[PDB]
Write a protein that binds this ligand. Structure first.
Ligand code: NAI
Length: 280
């Protein structure tokens, strides 16, 4: 019976413990998932314990996702471009880091029956979610990433990000300011998919979308949301509008968790049962 952890501060918020523990039980796997209060100062010590105690792995979240990069042996092509991970797997002393937010959101897409090979994505954000999604999307075959980020702390992260993807991928990424309501509207027109990776659409701001008009969207478009609180973001409302195919936050949240599960467990995630149980 091995231990799988969550290293973060705070942790009161996490849905991972209930989610993983429930998939683990309804499959009779010998693993337990426990959250632990861990910031940057205690993280090195915690990784030390993960090895000495022979834990199976641990989920990683704020504020250690970037720092955790320095404590693993093997990062993934995508992780390397993101510069952050949320999952560590201990393979008998050997530690491999991954970013399941990205694979999860992308997986959610391939699962709706949409191919991302050769498509153009219009990405909103450059934070943790956005860059993870962009990175994995580029590595699975995206032709273009029309990233739109404003003049805040993240713009420069966008460039370097755009920088890395270009330097090691076949994908072309362009960063463009989000107040340019036009080169954007036209960006949305060249796109097959629109992905919201911004906090916009979440409580308090459960009433604000990054797309002014509804006519800026089009019917054959796929719009994906990272926000799962609530279920129907303003952006998802404007989408169901234009007749767009939609994918919600619980999509990225469920598949992301399946990825960690299979990574630690080796078995398939009772995705179906967990969706029930968590009340989605
Ligand atoms: N369903 C799921 O599995 C997950 C959902 N998320 C959600 O995705 C969102 C992004 O979270 P993170 O990347 O972790 O946080 P973050 O703080 O790193 O990134 C937020 C991003 O939003 C942009 N942004 C924030 N306010 C903005 C505004 N007013 N206008 C334009 N851009 C703005 C910033 O440029 C930044 O890059 C959150 O709402 C989070 O709850 C995050 C992880 C998983």
């Amino acid at each position: 019976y091995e231990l799988i952890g969550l290293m973060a501060y705070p942790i009161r918020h996490s849905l991972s413990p209930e989610m993983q523990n429930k998939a683990l039980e309804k499959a009779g796997l010998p693993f337990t998932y426990m959250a632990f209060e861990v910031d940057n100062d205690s993280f090195p010590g915690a990784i030390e314990g993960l090895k000495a105690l022979k834990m199976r792995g641990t989920g990683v979240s704020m504020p250690n996702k970037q720092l955790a990069c320095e404590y693993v042996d093997e990062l993934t092509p995508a992780a390397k471009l993101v510069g952050a991970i949320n999952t560590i797997v201990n393979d008998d002393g050997y530690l491999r880091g991954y970013n399941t937010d990205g694979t999860g959101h992308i997986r959610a897409i391939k699962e709706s029956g949409f191919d991302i090979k050769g498509k153009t994505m219009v990405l909103l954000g450059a934070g943790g979610a956005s860059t993870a999604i962009g990175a994995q999307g580029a590595i699975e075959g995206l032709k273009e990433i029309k990233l739109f980020n404003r003049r805040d702390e993240f713009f420069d992260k966008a460039l370097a990000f755009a920088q890395r993807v270009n330097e090691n991928t076949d994908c072309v990424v362009t960063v463009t300011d989000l107040a340019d309501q036009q080169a954007f509207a036209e960006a949305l027109a060249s796109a097959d998919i629109l992905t919201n990776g911004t906090k916009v659409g979440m409580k308090p701001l459960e009433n604000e979308s990054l797309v002014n008009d509804i006519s800026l969207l089009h019917p054959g478009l796929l719009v994906t949301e990272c926000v799962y609180n609530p279920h129907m973001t303003k952006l998802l409302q404007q989408a169901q509008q234009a007749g767009c195919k939609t994918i919600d936050g619980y999509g990225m949240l469920l598949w992301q968790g399946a990825e960690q599960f299979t990574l630690w467990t080796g078995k398939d995630f009772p995705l179906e049962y967990v969706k029930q149980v968590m009340g989605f």
